Design an enzyme around this catalytic site. Sequence first.
Site, PDB file in Angstrom:
ATOM      1  N   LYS A  73       0.884  -1.122  -0.090  1.00 40.93           N
ATOM      2  CA  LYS A  73       0.113  -0.152  -0.048  1.00 40.93           C
ATOM      3  C   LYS A  73       0.815   1.352   0.199  1.00 40.93           C
ATOM      4  CE  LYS A  73      -3.866  -2.355   1.286  1.00 40.93           C
ATOM      5  NZ  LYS A  73      -4.488  -1.891   0.105  1.00 40.93           N
ATOM      6  N   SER A 259       1.581   4.842   2.879  1.00 35.63           N
ATOM      7  CA  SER A 259       0.647   6.040   3.076  1.00 35.63           C
ATOM      8  C   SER A 259       0.280   6.357   4.483  1.00 35.63           C
ATOM      9  CB  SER A 259      -0.784   5.215   2.482  1.00 35.63           C
ATOM     10  OG  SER A 259      -0.835   3.877   2.751  1.00 35.63           O
TER      11      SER A 259
END
Length: 691
Positions: A73, A259
């Site tokens: 991610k 993130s």
Amino acid sequence: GRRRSVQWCAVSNPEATKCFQWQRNMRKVRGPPVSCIKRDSPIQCIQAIAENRADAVTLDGGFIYEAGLAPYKLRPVAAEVYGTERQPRTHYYAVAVVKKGGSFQLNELQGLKSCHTGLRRTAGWNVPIGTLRPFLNWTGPPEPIEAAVARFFSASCVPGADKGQFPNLCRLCAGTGENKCAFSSQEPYFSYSGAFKCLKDGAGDVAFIRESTVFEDLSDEAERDEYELLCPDNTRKPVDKFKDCHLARVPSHAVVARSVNGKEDAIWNLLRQAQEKFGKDKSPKFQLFGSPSGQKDLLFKDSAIGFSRVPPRIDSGLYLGSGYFTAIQNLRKSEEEVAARRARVVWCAVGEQELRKCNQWSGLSEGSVTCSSASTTEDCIALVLKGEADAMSLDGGYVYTAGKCGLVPVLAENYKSQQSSDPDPNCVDRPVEGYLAVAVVRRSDTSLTWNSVKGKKSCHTAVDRTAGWNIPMGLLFNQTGSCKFDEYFSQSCAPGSDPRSNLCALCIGDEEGENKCVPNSNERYYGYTGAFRCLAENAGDVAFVKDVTVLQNTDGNNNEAWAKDLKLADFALLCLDGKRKPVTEARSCHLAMAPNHAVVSRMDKVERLKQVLLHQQAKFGRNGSDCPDKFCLFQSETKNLLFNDNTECLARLHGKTTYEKYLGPQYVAGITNLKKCSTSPLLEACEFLRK
Ligand SMILES: [Cl-]
């Protein structure tokens, strides 16, 4: 915790070496520090960042993809700028060039002849072949994709293909002897230019290249009008229309980070400085963008000239765009999954009450409608840009934003042509006429007028909505010149605003006090109905709604106990001239006309989408076979879920199929002017992907 160091990730010793030369020269300037770690490949580095052993690495679009997946991610935080300053390029478009005068459209490449830049290249193969997967007959991973495209075109020039396994992919290749079909220059139909000349010469019918090619290789500006590009909505347009007719926009390489707790701040500080001082033509002692004599693009591309901070709302999926994102997923996916997914319509529900209705709808759709959800309208838009969702109905205020994002209007919400009137059997072809935005007040304070509404309490449906915001705030703006929205009114309930502002001071959230000011149904003072309730409960002094709103919430048209005894006669309207008029007179006392809400989507989904709605309408619309028996699409009643409750039918656009055309020029001009003072995370995001 971990030193004010940004830890860079290197993929080669050479890279590790440049890194170290970076670290030392940043120390020498008393500039932000950078450490270096070395791994053997891009995924190793993606793994490193995600396990907290490194901070950033720059990646190409295929790795941006892999990195955005679980378990990593990661996210793009800075983009490489190529070109020259003043000629800055953050991307290019993957286009399908064909010559002028054909009736074949993308849906019909079948049996033609193709010219590609080379096996496994972005624009000559990944994008085009991923885009066409739906048509290939190709079981899947594995059987080699090559086997199926060889069975789809009758001949291609796919440099680098196996002329022994797929002779067809090499048959239009112009190389002599064994050079024939080589992934080299020894092959004249190799890369952008060989692929375009392949068209140019008359060997193939379609060339899959990049937009610049067409420009840089076509001399006059006349045999350029001898060319045409294929659009994903099966149209053809001229070559300078590439910003509207392209298979994919391939973005420049990007510096990716975590993130969550990515140090993106650190990273951009480092980079901006690295750039001012070690930029291009900045210092002889070190060059960020430069590789030692037998090496190419160490850490950064040697052709980059700087970096662009990617807005925080961008994702790897938004970064690549739907064309590019879905091309990559198609090439992985089973054929049944691709099948299923192009048939289904994924609706995007804003909020849990809207998802409840959707689900119900989905149950009875005989498999054609499925639901996805988000907490906000911008979040739903972003799910359709990602190809994760396909449609939703939006106010014209959000039709502009989704249009700036590349989305298009499909059908409009048609309302009955005036306050009391009859059903039109031809609702679907009746031209939309808009609706009226009003400023309603309680009849008690006699002295309140349009000229004294400044300084009071207001109830807005939501921020960026037409009647609730654009019109009233546009009007006031015209009057004062001020971009300080939060000073127009004392206190307000304006969903979607800053929770800590006066703009959210009157919202009440849900029954427990939560969701205060969120722009979805959980806020009791949200939408048409919630802004009316905000007035009726005497939280605010004026509500910016549509004329029909009062009608649906009074005289018992709304069941809810707060509404039950309201009387039409208890409300007035604020007219632009200072008069106060009864609610039945909105026709002569409104703020402005607003465009009808419209169902928007991606060009690739438009024909499937009309088809499912027309059809869903017929069963569940206003005069429909199962409504009210089983389900009514346009009823929630004063609820306004998925669609406005006074929607007669979904109707055609009459060629008005671009946000610009559908809203019309004075609407556009007005919002444009307003976005000057302030934007939104998504408009921002989309302006960046289109710059
Ligand atoms: Cl509104």
